[PDB]
Amino acid sequence: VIGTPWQKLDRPVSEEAIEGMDKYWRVTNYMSIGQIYLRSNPLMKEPFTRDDVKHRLVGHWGTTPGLNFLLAHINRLIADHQQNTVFIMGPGHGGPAGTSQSYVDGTYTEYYPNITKDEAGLQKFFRQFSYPGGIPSHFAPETPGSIHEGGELGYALSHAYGAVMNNPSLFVPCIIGDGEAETGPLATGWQSNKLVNPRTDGIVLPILHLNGYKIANPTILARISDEELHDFFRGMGYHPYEFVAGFDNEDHMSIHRRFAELFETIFDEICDIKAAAQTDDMTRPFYPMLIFRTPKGWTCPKFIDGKKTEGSWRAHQVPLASARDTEEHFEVLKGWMESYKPEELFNADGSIKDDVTAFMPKGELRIGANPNANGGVIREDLKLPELDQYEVTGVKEYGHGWGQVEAPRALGAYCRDIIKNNPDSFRIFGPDETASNRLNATYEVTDKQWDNGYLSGLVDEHMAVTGQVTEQLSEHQCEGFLEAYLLTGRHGIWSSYESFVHVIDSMLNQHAKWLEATVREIPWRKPISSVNLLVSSHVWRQDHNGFSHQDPGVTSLLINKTFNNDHVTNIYFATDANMLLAISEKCFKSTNKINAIFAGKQPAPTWVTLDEARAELEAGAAEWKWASNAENNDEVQVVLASAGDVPTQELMAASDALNKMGIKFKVVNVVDLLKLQSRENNDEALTDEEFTELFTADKPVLFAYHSYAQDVRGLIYDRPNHDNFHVVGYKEQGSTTTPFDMVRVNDMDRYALQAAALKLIDADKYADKIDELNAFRKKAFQFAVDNGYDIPEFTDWVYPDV
Amino acid sequence: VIGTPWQKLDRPVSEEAIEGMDKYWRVTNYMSIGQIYLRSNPLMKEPFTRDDVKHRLVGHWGTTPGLNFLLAHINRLIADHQQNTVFIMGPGHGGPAGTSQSYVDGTYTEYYPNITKDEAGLQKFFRQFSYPGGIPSHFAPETPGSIHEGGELGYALSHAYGAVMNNPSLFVPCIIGDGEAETGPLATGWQSNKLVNPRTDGIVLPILHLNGYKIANPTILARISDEELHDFFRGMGYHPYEFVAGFDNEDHMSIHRRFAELFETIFDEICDIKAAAQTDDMTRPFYPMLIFRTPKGWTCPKFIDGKKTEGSWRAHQVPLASARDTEEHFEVLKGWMESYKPEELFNADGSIKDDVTAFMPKGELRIGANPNANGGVIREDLKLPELDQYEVTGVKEYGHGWGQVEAPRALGAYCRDIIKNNPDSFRIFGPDETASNRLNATYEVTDKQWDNGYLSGLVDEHMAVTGQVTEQLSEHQCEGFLEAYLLTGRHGIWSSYESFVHVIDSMLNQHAKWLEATVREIPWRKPISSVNLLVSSHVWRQDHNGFSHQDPGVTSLLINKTFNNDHVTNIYFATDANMLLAISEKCFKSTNKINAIFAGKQPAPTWVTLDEARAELEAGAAEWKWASNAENNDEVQVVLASAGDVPTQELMAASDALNKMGIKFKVVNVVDLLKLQSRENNDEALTDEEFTELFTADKPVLFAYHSYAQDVRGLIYDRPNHDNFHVVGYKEQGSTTTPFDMVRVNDMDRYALQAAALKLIDADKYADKIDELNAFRKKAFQFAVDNGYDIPEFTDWVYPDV
Ligand SMILES: CC1=C(CCOP(=O)(O)OP(=O)(O)O)S/C(=C(/O)CO)N1Cc1cnc(C)nc1N
Ligand SMILES: CC1=C(CCOP(=O)(O)OP(=O)(O)O)S/C(=C(/O)CO)N1Cc1cnc(C)nc1N
Numbered sequence A, B: 001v002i003g004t005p006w007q008k009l010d011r012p013v014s015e016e017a018i019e020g021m022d023k024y025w026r027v028t029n030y031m032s033i034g035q036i037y038l039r040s041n042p043l044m045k046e047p048f049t050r051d052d053v054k055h056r057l058v059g060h061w062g063t064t065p066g067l068n069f070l071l072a073h074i075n076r077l078i079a080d081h082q083q084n085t086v087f088i089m090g091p092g093h094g095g096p097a098g099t100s101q102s103y104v105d106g107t108y109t110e111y112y113p114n115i116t117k118d119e120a121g122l123q124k125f126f127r128q129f130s131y132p133g134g135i136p137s138h139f140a141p142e143t144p145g146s147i148h149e150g151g152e153l154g155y156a157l158s159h160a161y162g163a164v165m166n167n168p169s170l171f172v173p174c175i176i177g178d179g180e181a182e183t184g185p186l187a188t189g190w191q192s193n194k195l196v197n198p199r200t201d202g203i204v205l206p207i208l209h210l211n212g213y214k215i216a217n218p219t220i221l222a223r224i225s226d227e228e229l230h231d232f233f234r235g236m237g238y239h240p241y242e243f244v245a246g247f248d249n250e251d252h253m254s255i256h257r258r259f260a261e262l263f264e265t266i267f268d269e270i271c272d273i274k275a276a277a278q279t280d281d282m283t284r285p286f287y288p289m290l291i292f293r294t295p296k297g298w299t300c301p302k303f304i305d306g307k308k309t310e311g312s313w314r315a316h317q318v319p320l321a322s323a324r325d326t327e328e329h330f331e332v333l334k335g336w337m338e339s340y341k342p343e344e345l346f347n348a349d350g351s352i353k354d355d356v357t358a359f360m361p362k363g364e365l366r367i368g369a370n371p372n373a374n375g376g377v378i379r380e381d382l383k384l385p386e387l388d389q390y391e392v393t394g395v396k397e398y399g400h401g402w403g404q405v406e407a408p409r410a411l412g413a414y415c416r417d418i419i420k421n422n423p424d425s426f427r428i429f430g431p432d433e434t435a436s437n438r439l440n441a442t443y444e445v446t447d448k449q450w451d452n453g454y455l456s457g458l459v460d461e462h463m464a465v466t467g468q469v470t471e472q473l474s475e476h477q478c479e480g481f482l483e484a485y486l487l488t489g490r491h492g493i494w495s496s497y498e499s500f501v502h503v504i505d506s507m508l509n510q511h512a513k514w515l516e517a518t519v520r521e522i523p524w525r526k527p528i529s530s531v532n533l534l535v536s537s538h539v540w541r542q543d544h545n546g547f548s549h550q551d552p553g554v555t556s557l558l559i560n561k562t563f564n565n566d567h568v569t570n571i572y573f574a575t576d577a578n579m580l581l582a583i584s585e586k587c588f589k590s591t592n593k594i595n596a597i598f599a600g601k602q603p604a605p606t607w608v609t610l611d612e613a614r615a616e617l618e619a620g621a622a623e624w625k626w627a628s629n630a631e632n633n634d635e636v637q638v639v640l641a642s643a644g645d646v647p648t649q650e651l652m653a654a655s656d657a658l659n660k661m662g663i664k665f666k667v668v669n670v671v672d673l674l675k676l677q678s679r680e681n682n683d684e685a686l687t688d689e690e691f692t693e694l695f696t697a698d699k700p701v702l703f704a705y706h707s708y709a710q711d712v713r714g715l716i717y718d719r720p721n722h723d724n725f726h727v728v729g730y731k732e733q734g735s736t737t738t739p740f741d742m743v744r745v746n747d748m749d750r751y752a753l754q755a756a757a758l759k760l761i762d763a764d765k766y767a768d769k770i771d772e773l774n775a776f777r778k779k780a781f782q783f784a785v786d787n788g789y790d791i792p793e794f795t796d797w798v799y800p801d802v
């Protein structure tokens, strides 16, 4: 248990804590300006000149002093209440407020021994901010206290809420940019309080950083009427409190006393909600939120060159951009840095005075030290059930190609038993698609958690105010909740209709970059569990839905996060349920990855046994010798290669026909896509030798690909024999139609695959047979048109091993 | 002018209109069930059997009767008021309500002469819905009345609002799924009423289709308290009205009279807002919205196999999935279809009776016929100013490589004069980035439109309650507003930080699919203006921001919409401002495209004259003979090829150094990327012959690529000499650093490019020179670390032609 969760003070905030908060605010403002502007002389020791200013002024002042003010008050709260706390910096461009916090709390020096607590250290701390060889401009992963960089705005609230799931002792003040609040993802993020339980989950306090402005405009929320703003937050299930400061001549000490008093009232109400929820965990409370209205750039010069800067968008980036070049700007910077009275804040040795920090939390309650902000320190391996009990054994008993299994249902049963063994640290998320994607065996042991109104057992099924499945019709919510749940040291999976994975392409980009930085250069930030995404309801079988639901191209996006041997991204094609099982076990054991797990949910043949799935998954690509008919590679007329359940079924039916014509070929299944790359691009890929062994030194290869052929083509560009590959993939053809017609219009159906194989072997010789295959596809299509269902020769075909 | 906009009735709705609306509702429900279930016998003529039911039951009943009810009432409104109206079907899976509407209004038969108004036609109309060879399951582009398919949920409101921009006579009832409202994009879409002006823009009426449920869950909005729901919409600046029907035994005629009366009150209030706005166009009104609360699946059987179906998520897709297979389900379907009393709705010849449609609007006010729902019928070419006056003439006067121009500023001046010549049909959108992306010369002739509070001329600049620039910190809003503005026949452009384009990857996917279907098979849907996206503030120069802002991979997503010779997607690299000018003119003249226009906004050399830009843009790739030093292709030791402003600057400096060593090469610039593909994949690409002429038959090619090398590699896989290309691209390396260091860590800097060229020519011979180049890059980096700015030999280099 960290600290004493949810305890009220029952006394006023002390005047000593007020004094310490004002010193914190002044010292973090001063060091924030130092980080932005100063390359040397951090204490402005005589002579202090333009030669001490950075030649390249980069960074963001505007948000920063509002952040620094909140952080003083959140630190004071943590210390007084002994409250387990992780904050979110929505405006992650306020990085210097986040580095200043960690430097004040002591964690910065603990993690970075060279950045010492004295003038030499402070010199280095100032120069290194957004500087070549130094540190980022944003609240990056290498800052102690960060689980959220906030470079790409919008995910503040899904991360805050994901962090408090099954974390009942954790408090998350979530600081949200008022420009950020104009984004889609943030606007829906407010509604998460219908999806958390105040007894089993912790508490988010949204704090709207209402500084009036974004980069070059006012914000929507700052300029509507106060009554609309209050009705808005109340209508989303919050109790709104509003603080306004810095627009008049109120002295700063009074501002701190009024805020501290307000913040105690807010926390008291959180504590009341927490206490009440031990008895009534079904009534959804109105959680507090804070509207925090202060001038953008608060405490910077009011006008600069006749332009309003404090209380404007002009404060957004770097004020006084000429501080190095004109004595006029330099003098303004000098008076601005002096207004914080650094001589009262630093000892002569340049260490921050003890009376600046006596109010601060200590040990693991410090924002930089809390283990929830470094969740791999808390994470434990899942207790996984034995995989064997889930095996589709039909393949062993009856033959390769057996049955009509819906593959994710084996993952559902596996996930069911993972939740049972790990009842509060493995969650499933779905955008209203968990049942549609066939993971609903999980409801045998838990419920979809819903903390909003109930009506009737006739309609409410498998749903309770607490549980380990979460659904909201929002890929942004599913992906954001899950990320923070992993970042605080837990585990899970989500599923999405494949075409709609793209809604969160840019969230995958950011989480992969978080992973890239971490595995490269932040060894103190320990391994988190992986993002596991079941990509299902795929392009080939969108029977009720059509063309808008046909886009497997998240493969292509993921290929753009496969560099430097980071090994943070995996694309798995689950061939059948036994392969799905093997892949998922690997994924649930992995750390520091995004794993995209492709699997079809339609009824489909099972191809391999579980033991075969385990061996093949490890190699990444494998020959299926029981399906090959060639003696050896020199006898092979064409390589039949596939990746994806549906390309594989069609390749396999093609292989059966090609066998019956006396054609000689081998069958290669591809499961771990990126292992097709060269060792030069991926040091864990198949070696040239193993690649040649699978794909031959120079026979034609027909490659039936689940997604866009472009991917395989770019991946194999330097592989031996790549010029012989013919990649067939999805090509933006399709609609609401029969399963055969969907493969047909992409040349993916088994007849077109047989034709293509013939064309690669000898086009002249097989001219007629090709025409005949092409005409059979026309006839099978006419038949679908006339009769309403696919021709029985297509639908009734089982692989001859069965 | 269409109809008589914004006129009140000043009498009750007639009883004859009530009777016609109830008949419409019954006939569209009946034909919706027919489309889903029936392959023959649409009027259930004896014998009506299971043999008349589809073998594959696909589609969505649940939303459909609520849509059909609203559509009856919106048609009645249009007719009574003569009101120019386009609706949005948020739940676009309610396609049969949208096809039924067009069939009732007569447009379906007008566009599809074979689907006739009689029993034979109705037979065909039923079978063809989501059927092989037939029509989609959703409100697809081939349905008259659709500007919005609604397969991928979330964009209902940005499309509604974009449609009414500069469209002051247009009314848009926007029907929004209550599951849809859980998405990010929809949640922010509500706020658009702060960005439209009630005098110069038309009016959206959001109608929340609060049917209680999504696929397998209740919805957030349906289960919060009524007081929270009302405060929510009021707090977003609406006046909420709520209708509740179908939960009790109220007869349907009473339901229609109560709704019609409510809808007249709502419209009267819209008319009052429109009239008031002719005098006071600065006060933002509280626009009505409608909470429409009715049971999901309304009028279907209440229980099926003991399961509550009407008023449940179970009504979502296909009830009675066994209607063909068991007589039990068939009997239920038969009684359900009979409950609408089709014998009162159809004449014996199976034509819909005249008294079903006498209340309907006629001619161009019909929902299917309105030209705003087919905007290419209204669209006119832009009056473009002459390009020459924008030319950066520095290249002609001083030499290739001249100057420090910020390229988008020439596009800003061009856009400025486009707005001036086309003052109400060309808009610019930006996510708070129009000024940052250097398009702010447009503010010389118009303002950012902001219909929300003002504070002071000290802070509010270039902003007014009306204007042709729109900003909101939401890529979803920018992309949605623009799409509908083009779909209703107008023009514009938006700009985004390149890494954040990915937020709307999936919107680009849908709009490209809309375009694919249209250019392939909907000739009646005329060409719209193109989506023009300035992709700027790119990966190489994110000086204030760092790694989270470095992701040029929208290139890769776009490559997945380049099939079948559709020609709906273009990726342009603007080399400099003269190239930018040429590309933009092409884009502003194009139709039916998405054009991604890459351009840097940092100061940069101008390479080509405007006349050269025009020729080179047309070919797609071009030799720069003034920069090549080889005689001819056989004398070439390496091809220096680049795409992007920064790769080009670095290639060019490399070329200067390689020249001074006596190396022989040619320089090829690439502007139109997809013209690198083979003619087999793209019938407008460079032919093999022209490709070979540029890239040689067999010399090494060094290709410096703006984005991920993967793209070029997959694109050129079947081109002559592709095995000789070495593609250098972005490789997930970078942070907040100097411009040289950013190119350095991706091996993109000029020294690494010179090294790479040497390595391709003769690695052994140039071993030493390579090492020396590699060490110079280390020294230039140390210098940045030590001094705060890049080494003057890097920054001060100008191409020797200057
Ligand atoms: C538009 C924008 C910013 C203004 C934020 O305004 P705010 O009100 O949220 O914060 P403050 O006023 O507290 O500064 S900071 C920023 C940068 O590129 C930095 O990441 N960008 C570009 C941006 C656009 N879109 C997205 C999704 N994320 C972004 N970071
Ligand atoms: C989740 C979902 C639907 C429920 C919609 O519920 P609603 O309340 O908005 O509409 P009704 O109750 O009026 O039916 S219909 C649907 C399909 O795949 C169809 O496009 N999907 C999957 C889906 C997920 N995510 C996105 C962005 N779009 C989607 N269409």
Ligand SMILES: [Mg+2]
Pocket (backbone or CB within 6 Å): A177, A178, A179, A209, A210, A211, A212, A213, A214, A219
């Ligand atoms: Mg702000």
Ligand SMILES: [Mg+2]
Pocket (backbone or CB within 6 Å): B177, B178, B179, B209, B210, B211, B212, B213, B214, B219
């Ligand atoms: Mg609904």
Ligand code: NA
Pocket (backbone or CB within 6 Å): A717, A722, A723, B717, B722, B723
């Ligand atoms: Na090759």
